[PDB]
PDB file of C-alpha atoms (C1' of nucleotides) and ligand atoms in Angstrom:
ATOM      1  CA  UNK O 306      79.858-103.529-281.008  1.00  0.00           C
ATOM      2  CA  UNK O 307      77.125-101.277-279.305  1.00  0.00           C
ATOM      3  CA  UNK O 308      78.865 -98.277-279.495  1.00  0.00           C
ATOM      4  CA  UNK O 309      81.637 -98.861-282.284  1.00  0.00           C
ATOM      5  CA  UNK O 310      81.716 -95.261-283.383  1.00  0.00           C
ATOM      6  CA  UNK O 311      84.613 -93.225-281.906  1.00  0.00           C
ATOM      7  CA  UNK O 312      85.714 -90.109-281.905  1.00  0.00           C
ATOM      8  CA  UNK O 313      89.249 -89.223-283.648  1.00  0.00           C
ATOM      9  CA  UNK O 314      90.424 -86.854-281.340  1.00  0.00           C
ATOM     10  CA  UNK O 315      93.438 -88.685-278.866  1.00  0.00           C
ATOM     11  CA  UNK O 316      91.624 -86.435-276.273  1.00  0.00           C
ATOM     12  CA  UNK O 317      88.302 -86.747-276.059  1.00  0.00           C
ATOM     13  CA  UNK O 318      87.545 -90.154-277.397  1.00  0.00           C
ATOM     14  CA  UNK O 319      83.890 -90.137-276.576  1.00  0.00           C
ATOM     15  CA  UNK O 320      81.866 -93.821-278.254  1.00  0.00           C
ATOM     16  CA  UNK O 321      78.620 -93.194-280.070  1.00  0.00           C
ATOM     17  CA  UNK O 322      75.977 -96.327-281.193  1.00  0.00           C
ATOM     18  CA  UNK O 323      74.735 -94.132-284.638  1.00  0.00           C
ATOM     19  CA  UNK O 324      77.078 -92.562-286.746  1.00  0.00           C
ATOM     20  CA  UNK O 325      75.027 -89.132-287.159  1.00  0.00           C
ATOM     21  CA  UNK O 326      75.486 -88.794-283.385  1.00  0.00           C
ATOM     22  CA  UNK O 327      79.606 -89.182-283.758  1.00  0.00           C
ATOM     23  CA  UNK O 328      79.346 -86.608-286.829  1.00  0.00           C
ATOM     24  CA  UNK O 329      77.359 -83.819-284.598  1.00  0.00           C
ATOM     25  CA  UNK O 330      79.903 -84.637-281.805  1.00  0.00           C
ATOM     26  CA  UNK O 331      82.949 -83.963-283.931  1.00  0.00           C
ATOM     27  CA  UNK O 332      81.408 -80.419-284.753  1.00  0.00           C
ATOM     28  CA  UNK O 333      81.995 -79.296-280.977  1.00  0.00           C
ATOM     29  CA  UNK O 334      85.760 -80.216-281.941  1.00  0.00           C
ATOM     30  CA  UNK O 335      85.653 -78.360-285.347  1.00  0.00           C
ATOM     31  CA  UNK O 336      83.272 -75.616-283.833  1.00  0.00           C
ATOM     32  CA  UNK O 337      80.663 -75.913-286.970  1.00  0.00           C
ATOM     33  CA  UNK O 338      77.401 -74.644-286.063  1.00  0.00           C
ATOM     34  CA  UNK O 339      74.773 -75.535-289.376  1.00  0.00           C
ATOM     35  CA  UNK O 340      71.629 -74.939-287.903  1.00  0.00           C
ATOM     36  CA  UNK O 341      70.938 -70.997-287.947  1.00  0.00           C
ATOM     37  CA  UNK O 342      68.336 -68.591-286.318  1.00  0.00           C
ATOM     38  CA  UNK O 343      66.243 -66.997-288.499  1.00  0.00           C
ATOM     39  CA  UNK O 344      65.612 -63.859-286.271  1.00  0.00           C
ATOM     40  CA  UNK O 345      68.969 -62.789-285.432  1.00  0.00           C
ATOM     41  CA  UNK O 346      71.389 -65.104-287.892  1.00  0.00           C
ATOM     42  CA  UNK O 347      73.014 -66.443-284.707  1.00  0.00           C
ATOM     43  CA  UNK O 348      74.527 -70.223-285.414  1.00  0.00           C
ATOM     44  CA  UNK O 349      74.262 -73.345-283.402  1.00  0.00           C
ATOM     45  CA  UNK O 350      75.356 -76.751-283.433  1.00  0.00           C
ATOM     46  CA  UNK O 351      72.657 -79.133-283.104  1.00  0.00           C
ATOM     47  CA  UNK O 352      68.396 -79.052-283.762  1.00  0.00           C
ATOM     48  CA  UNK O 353      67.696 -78.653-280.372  1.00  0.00           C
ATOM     49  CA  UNK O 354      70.450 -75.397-279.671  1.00  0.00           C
ATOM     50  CA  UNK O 355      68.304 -73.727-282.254  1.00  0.00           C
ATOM     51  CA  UNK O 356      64.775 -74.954-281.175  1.00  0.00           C
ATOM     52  CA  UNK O 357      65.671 -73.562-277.865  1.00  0.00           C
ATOM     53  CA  UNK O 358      66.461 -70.413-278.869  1.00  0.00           C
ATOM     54  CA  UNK O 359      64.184 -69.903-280.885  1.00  0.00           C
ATOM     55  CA  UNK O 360      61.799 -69.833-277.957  1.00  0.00           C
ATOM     56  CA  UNK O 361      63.792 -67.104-276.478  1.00  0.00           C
ATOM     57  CA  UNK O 362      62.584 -64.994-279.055  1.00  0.00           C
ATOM     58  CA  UNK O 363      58.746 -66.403-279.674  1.00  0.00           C
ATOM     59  CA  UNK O 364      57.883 -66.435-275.793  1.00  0.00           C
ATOM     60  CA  UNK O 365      56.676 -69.794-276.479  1.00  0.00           C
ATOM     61  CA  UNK O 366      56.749 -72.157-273.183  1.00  0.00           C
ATOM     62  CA  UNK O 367      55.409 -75.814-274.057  1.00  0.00           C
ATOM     63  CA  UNK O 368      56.935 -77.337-270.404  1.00  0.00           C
ATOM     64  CA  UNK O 369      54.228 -76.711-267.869  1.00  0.00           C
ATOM     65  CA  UNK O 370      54.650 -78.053-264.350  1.00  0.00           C
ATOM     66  CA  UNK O 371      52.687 -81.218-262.982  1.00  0.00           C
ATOM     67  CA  UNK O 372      52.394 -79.556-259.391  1.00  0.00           C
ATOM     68  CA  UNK O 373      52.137 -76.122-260.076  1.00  0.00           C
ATOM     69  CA  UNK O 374      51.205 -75.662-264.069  1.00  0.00           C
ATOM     70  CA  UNK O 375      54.160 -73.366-264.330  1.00  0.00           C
ATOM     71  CA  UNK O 376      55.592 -73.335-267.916  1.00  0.00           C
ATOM     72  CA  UNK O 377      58.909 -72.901-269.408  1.00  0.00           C
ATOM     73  CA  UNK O 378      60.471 -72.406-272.421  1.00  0.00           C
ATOM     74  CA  UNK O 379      63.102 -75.791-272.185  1.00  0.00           C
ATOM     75  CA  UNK O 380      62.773 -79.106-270.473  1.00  0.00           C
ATOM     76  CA  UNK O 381      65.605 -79.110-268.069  1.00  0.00           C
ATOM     77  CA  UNK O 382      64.414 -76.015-266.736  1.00  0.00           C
ATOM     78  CA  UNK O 383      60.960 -77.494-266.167  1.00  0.00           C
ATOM     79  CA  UNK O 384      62.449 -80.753-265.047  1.00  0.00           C
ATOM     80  CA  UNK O 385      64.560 -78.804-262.168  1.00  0.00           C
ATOM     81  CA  UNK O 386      61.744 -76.590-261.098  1.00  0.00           C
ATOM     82  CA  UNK O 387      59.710 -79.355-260.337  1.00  0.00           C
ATOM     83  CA  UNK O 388      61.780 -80.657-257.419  1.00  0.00           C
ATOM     84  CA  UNK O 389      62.180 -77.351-255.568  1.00  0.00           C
ATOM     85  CA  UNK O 390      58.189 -78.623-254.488  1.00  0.00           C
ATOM     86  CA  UNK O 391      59.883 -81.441-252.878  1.00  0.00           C
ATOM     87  CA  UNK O 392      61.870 -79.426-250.015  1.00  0.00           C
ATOM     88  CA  UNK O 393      62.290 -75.993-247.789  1.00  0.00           C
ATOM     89  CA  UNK O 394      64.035 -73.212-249.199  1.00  0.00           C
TER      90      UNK O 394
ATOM     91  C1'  DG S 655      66.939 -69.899-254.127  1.00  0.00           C
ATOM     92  C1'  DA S 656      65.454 -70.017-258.792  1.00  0.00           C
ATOM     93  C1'  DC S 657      65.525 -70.029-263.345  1.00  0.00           C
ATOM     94  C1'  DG S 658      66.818 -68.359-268.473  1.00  0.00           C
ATOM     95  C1'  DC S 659      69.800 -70.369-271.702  1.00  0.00           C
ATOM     96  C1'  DT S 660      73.410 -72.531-274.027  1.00  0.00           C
ATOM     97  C1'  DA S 661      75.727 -77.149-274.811  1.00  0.00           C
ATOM     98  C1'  DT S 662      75.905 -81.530-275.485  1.00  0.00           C
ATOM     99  C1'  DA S 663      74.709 -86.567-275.133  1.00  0.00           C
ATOM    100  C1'  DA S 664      71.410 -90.334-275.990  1.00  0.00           C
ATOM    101  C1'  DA S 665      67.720 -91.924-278.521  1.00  0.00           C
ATOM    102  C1'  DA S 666      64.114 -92.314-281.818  1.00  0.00           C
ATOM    103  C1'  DG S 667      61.484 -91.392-286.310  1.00  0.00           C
ATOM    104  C1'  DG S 668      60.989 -92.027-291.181  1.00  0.00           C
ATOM    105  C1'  DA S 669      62.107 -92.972-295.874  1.00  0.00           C
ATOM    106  C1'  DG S 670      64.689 -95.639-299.411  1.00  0.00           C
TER     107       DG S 670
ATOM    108  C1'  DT Q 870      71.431 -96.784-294.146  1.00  0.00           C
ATOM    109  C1'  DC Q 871      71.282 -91.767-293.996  1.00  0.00           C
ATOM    110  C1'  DC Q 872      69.139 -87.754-292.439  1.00  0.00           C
ATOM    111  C1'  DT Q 873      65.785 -85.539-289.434  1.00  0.00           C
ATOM    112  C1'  DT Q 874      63.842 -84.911-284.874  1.00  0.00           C
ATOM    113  C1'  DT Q 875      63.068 -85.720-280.180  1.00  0.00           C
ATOM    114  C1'  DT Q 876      64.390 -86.476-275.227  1.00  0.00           C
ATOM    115  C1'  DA Q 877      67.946 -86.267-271.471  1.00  0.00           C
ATOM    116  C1'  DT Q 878      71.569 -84.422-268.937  1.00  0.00           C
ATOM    117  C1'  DA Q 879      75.115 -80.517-267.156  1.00  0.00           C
ATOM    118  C1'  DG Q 880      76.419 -76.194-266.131  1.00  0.00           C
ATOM    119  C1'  DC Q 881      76.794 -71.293-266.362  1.00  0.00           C
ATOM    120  C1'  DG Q 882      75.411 -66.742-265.076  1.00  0.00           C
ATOM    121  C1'  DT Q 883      72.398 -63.605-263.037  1.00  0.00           C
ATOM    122  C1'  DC Q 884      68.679 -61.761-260.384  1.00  0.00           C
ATOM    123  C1'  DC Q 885      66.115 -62.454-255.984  1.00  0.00           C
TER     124       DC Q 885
HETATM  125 ZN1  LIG E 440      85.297 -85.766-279.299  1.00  0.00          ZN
HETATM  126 ZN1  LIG E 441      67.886 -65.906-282.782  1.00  0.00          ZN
HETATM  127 ZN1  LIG E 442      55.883 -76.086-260.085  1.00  0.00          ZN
END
DNA sequence: GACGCTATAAAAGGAG
DNA sequence: TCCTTTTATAGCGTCC
């Protein structure tokens, strides 16, 4: 079994390897959000939702770009920047 | 075009 | 293991 944690909803039944990651999945289903902002009490569901807002309020932008030395506040946003350097508008 | 941000999935770290 | 953190992936919404 490499992924023999599933999820209970009929629905959705989405397969996780570690259980933690089927328990933080489930609260998108229950709509729990633990993790809480500090600055302006607004919830989230996982580590990462908060960590990334929590940039929106510091300023702080730890992705810098490779080609350009750009920075940015998340990684997808850095990650997607990068290729516009790779074509015409 | 570009990118700020939220969501969410996949994976890894560390301690008992 | 269980709990904490870290990395990856998808879109949305809005301004240019
Ligand atoms: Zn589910
Ligand atoms: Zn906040
Ligand atoms: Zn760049």
């Amino acid at each position: 079994m490499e992924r023999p944690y599933a999820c209970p909803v009929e629905s959705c039944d989405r397969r996780f390897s570690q259980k933690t990651n089927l328990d933080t999945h489930i609260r998108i289903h229950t709509g729990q959000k633990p993790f809480q902002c500090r600055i302006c009490m607004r919830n989230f569901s996982q580590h990462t939702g908060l960590n990334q807002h929590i940039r929106t309020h510091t300023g702080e932008k730890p992705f810098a770009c490779d080609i350009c030395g750009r920075k940015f506040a998340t990684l997808h946003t850095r990650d997607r920047h990068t290729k516009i350097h790779l074509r015409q508008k």
